[PDB]
């Protein structure tokens, strides 16, 4: 046996560490700027323009994602790929061509002895210690709902939402602009991101709090005051009308997804609801999500949200847990299998 | 051939995924005991980057046919089934059984002439107009049965050990 490497590719940033650890060794934004790689390259905004190799869960350009794995392999973790098996994450309903190309690129360029892809949301469900339950995954770019039945994502039940952390960050930019404070700088956009990280909390009900302030100093030296943006922004996640997007809210999507599944599973699925993603860790999300779902849920069954304190890297924690398991060692795609059957082996065993 | 392959692949994938989920559940209850024993991490220096079953013809079986709804009740003899057997020895007893069984639903009969597989109802001159006259399903399966050797039933000379005396 050997130690299995675990790498998680998120939209906002890439997560990577070691099997069995409770925290990833490194966290980098995974931004590529072609005139280097990483946040150090992001600092040099002049000669090279920042770009995202991964976007909306789909690889826009592989020629920079190759640099992404090179950076996360040789400059952050600094192990030996030629001997260490590598585990990678991928968003659901991924087009098959992307999976084929990813498997081929890894097994060819990196000569990884064993490479197994899995759904990031089912990896998150593998955290918190329950086999079943809806995973309301919401990354920086894409929101997912995957009713999981013994780990097998029910293929017809996945629903995709375009509501994302970046979209709400832009909404915060707009509402700060209309407040009177325009922040054109991308660094200022990240400052607004941190501001909504700290003070913003989910209102129990939009209208009751609307009829009813906090100020944080900007790092440059001036304090900014916002009164209604604290609760307006979290409700924008529930009601995308202000965002202008035709997509529904979180509660309606969850209800539709749970009703699309089989009836005999819905009883356990309601009780074992799991939430994850760095976007949805907003304070107060649990009680509101609970109350709206219970309003739309049948009265016989019990609704139980299970918000975990480790939301920001729960997917990586679950992936490391799965990789450390002994029985999981058989599931790996061996090198000889890829040589014998070609890249199309990924859709057969993963 | 591909249809039987797809059906058995779906069943095997469901079985493997539920086994993985059960393993995760067992880990989250009995403790890191079922986890791997781990190996030392070989960290390489900055210079190194400056220059820069589970094995052997595996033959995975497939689950019986109950699919998804009935299978979380885990209809098992006494233990989880063998879903991966790559050691390939089969205690050296079943190896010949495995290697000398005809592959079923073969597309090409090893380029032996041309040949043509017809419907089983076409072999029979009878039209199977009665329930009793139903010709075989021909699902291409082999049953395994152990038998007493006919040579064992044959009479054999007495074998024993002499005591103090009695020899010749």
């Amino acid at each position: 046996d050997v130690a299995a490497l675990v790498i998680d590719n998120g939209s906002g940033m890439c997560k990577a560490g070691y099997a069995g650890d409770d925290a990833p060794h490194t966290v980098f934004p995974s931004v590529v700027g072609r005139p280097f790689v990483g946040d150090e390259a992001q600092s040099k905004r002049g000669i090279l323009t920042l770009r995202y190799p991964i976007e909306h869960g789909i690889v826009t350009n592989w020629d920079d994602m190759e640099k992404i794995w090179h950076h996360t392999f040789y400059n952050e973790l600094r192990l030996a790929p030629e001997e260490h098996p590598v585990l990678l994450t991928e968003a659901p309903m991924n087009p098959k061509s992307n999976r084929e190309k990813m498997t081929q690129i890894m097994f060819e360029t990196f000569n990884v002895p064993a490479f197994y892809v899995s759904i990031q949301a089912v990896l998150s469900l593998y955290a918190s210690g329950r086999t079943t339950g809806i995973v309301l995954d919401s990354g920086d770019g894409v929101t997912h709902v995957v009713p999981i039945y013994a780990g097998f994502s029910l293929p017809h039940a996945i629903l995709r939402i375009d509501l994302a952390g970046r979209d709400l960050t832009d909404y915060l930019m707009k509402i700060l602009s209309e407040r009177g404070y325009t922040f054109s700088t991308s660094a200022e956009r990240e400052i607004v991101r941190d501001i909504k990280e700290k003070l913003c909390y989910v209102a129990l009900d939009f209208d009751q709090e609307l009829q009813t302030e906090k100020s944080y100093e900007l790092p440059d030296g001036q304090v900014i005051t916002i009164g209604n943006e604290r609760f307006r922004a979290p409700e924008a996640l529930f009601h995308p009308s202000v965002l202008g997007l035709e997509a529904s809210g979180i509660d309606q999507t969850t209800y539709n997804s749970i009703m699309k599944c089989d009836v005999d599973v819905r009883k356990e699925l309601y009780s074992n609801i799991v939430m994850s993603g760095g976007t949805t860790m907003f304070p107060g999300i649990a009680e509101r999500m609970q109350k709206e779902l219970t309003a739309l849920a049948p009265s016989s069954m019990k609704v139980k949200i299970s918000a975990p304190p480790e939301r920001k890297y729960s997917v990586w924690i679950g992936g490391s847990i799965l990789a450390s398991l002994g029985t999981f060692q058989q599931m790996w795609i061996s090198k000889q299998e890829y040589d014998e059957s070609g890249p199309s082996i990924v859709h057969l065993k993963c | 051939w591909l249809s039987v392959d797809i059906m058995e692949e779906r069943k095997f994938k469901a079985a493997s995924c539920v086994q993985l989920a059960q393993a995760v559940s067992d880990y989250w209850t009995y403790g890191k005991i079922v986890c791997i024993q781990r190996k030392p991490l070989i960290f390489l220096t900055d210079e190194e980057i400056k220059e820069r079953n589970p094995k052997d013809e595996i033959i995975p079986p497939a689950l019986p046919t109950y699919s998804m709804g009935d299978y979380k009740r885990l209809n098992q003899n006494a233990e989880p089934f063998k879903l991966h057997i790559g050691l390939d020895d089969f205690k050296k007893e079943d190896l010949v059984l495995v290697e000398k069984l005809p592959l079923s639903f073969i597309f090409d009969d090893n380029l032996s002439d041309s040949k043509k597989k017809l419907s089983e109802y076409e072999k029979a001159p009878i039209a199977a107009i009665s329930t009793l006259l139903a010709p075989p399903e021909d699902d291409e399966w082999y049953k395994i049965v152990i038998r007493r050797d006919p040579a064992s039933e044959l009479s054999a000379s007495l074998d024993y050990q002499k005591g103090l005396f009695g020899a010749s």
Binding site: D22, A23, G129, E310 | W28, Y30, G31, I33, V34
Partner: peptide
Amino acid sequence: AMDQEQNQPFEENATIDVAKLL
């Protein structure tokens, strides 16, 4: 970037998982 928790309530930490598994 810190490790929040642990929870290996070994109902059986005996080193023989089948001590309770069986």
